[PDB]
Design a protein around this ligand. Structure first.
Ligand SMILES: CCc1cccc(CC)c1NC(=O)c1nn(C)c2c1CCc1cnc(Nc3ccc(C(=O)NC4CCN(C)CC4)cc3OC(F)(F)F)nc1-2
Length: 263
């Protein structure tokens, strides 16, 4: 009713799209569920550039170049079918998903270990691909993963500068708080998998943000890893959540880990 839009429409590279409903918003951006002339479903991401400075415009141009390139490198990265860039906006014709990983983790009280593992593999493949091109996301959270036919797709690369018209610290690595390295993404992914394992992020129980920030960097604040039937899973978590990035496990090391390899 009030969630669904009527008689609305838009053009991207001359091709006409019917706007069904608005499925997202963040900053000066909107995401719409659309149909093309062939009745195929897509997500059009609209970005408003009217108040963007040259540095911000460049951050959007750089992210689009990378997303259009790296999609041929891994199916764990969202499809970018087409885009229209002008001085006033960006319209990006993307792959449509039923739900994002944040919303889905909020619904599901219990996640299947086979499903949790499949999800882990998808996230590792997506992040591994962007690291191979010199990109460290540095702001990974479950909201950055779209579920498309039971498979996770990474939505963005963290390159673009979010425009102020919020951001959780729960996934922030200790080295980020101290101030960049692929290991920063390993910590954040670790927090996502810890949520899929224990039903919460490692520091979710701490209400005060400053207490939480000191808890992430404190070497004497021991992170609890309750015993679970999957000992390989427990080892992954312990290895991702090492406060020294130099001692923390690497993505190529995680891809050869028994948790991901041993049936
Ligand atoms: C534009 C904002 C932005 C800026 C910077 C960075 C990023 C990446 C995170 C982004 N954000 C984005 O770029 C972005 N945000 N969303 C939400 C989508 C995108 C791009 C592709 C895309 C494709 N399909 C979807 N679909 C849906 C995504 C999430 C939900 C959802 O939240 N469902 C909830 C279920 C529970 N109930 C109670 C509440 C709703 C439902 C969806 O499917 C639908 F079509 F059916 F609706 N979303 C997106």
């Amino acid at each position: 009713g009030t969630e669904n839009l009527y008689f609305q429409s838009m053009s991207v590279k001359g091709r006409i799209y019917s706007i069904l409903k608005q499925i997202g918003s963040g900053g000066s951006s909107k995401v719409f569920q659309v149909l093309n002339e062939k009745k195929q479903i897509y997500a059009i991401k609209y970005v408003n550039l009217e108040e963007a400075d040259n540095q911000t415009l460049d951050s959007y141009r750089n992210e689009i170049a990378y997303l259009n390139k790296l999609q041929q490198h891994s199916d764990k990265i969202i499809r970018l079918y087409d885009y229209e860039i002008t001085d006033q906006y960006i319209y990006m014709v993307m792959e449509w998903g039923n739900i994002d990983l944040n919303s889905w983790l909020k619904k599901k009280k219990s996640i299947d270990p086979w499903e949790r593992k499949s999800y882990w593999k998808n996230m590792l493949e997506a992040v591994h691909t962007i690291h191979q091109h010199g990109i460290v996301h540095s702001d990974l959270k479950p909201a950055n993963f779209l579920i498309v036919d039971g498979m996770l797709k990474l939505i963005d690369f963290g390159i673009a500068n979010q425009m102020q018209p919020v951001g959780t610290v729960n996934y922030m690595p200790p080295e980020a708080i101290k101030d960049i390295s692929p290991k920063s993404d390993v910590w954040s992914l670790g927090c996502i998998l810890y949520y899929m394992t224990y039903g919460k992020t490692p520091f979710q129980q701490i209400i005060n943000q400053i207490s939480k920030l000191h808890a992430i960097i404190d070497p004497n604040h021991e992170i609890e890893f309750p015993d679970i039937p999957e000992k390989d899973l427990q080892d992954v978590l312990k290895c991702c959540l090492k406060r020294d990035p130099k001692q923390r496990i690497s993505i190529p090391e995680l891809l050869a880990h028994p948790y991901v390899q041993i049936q």
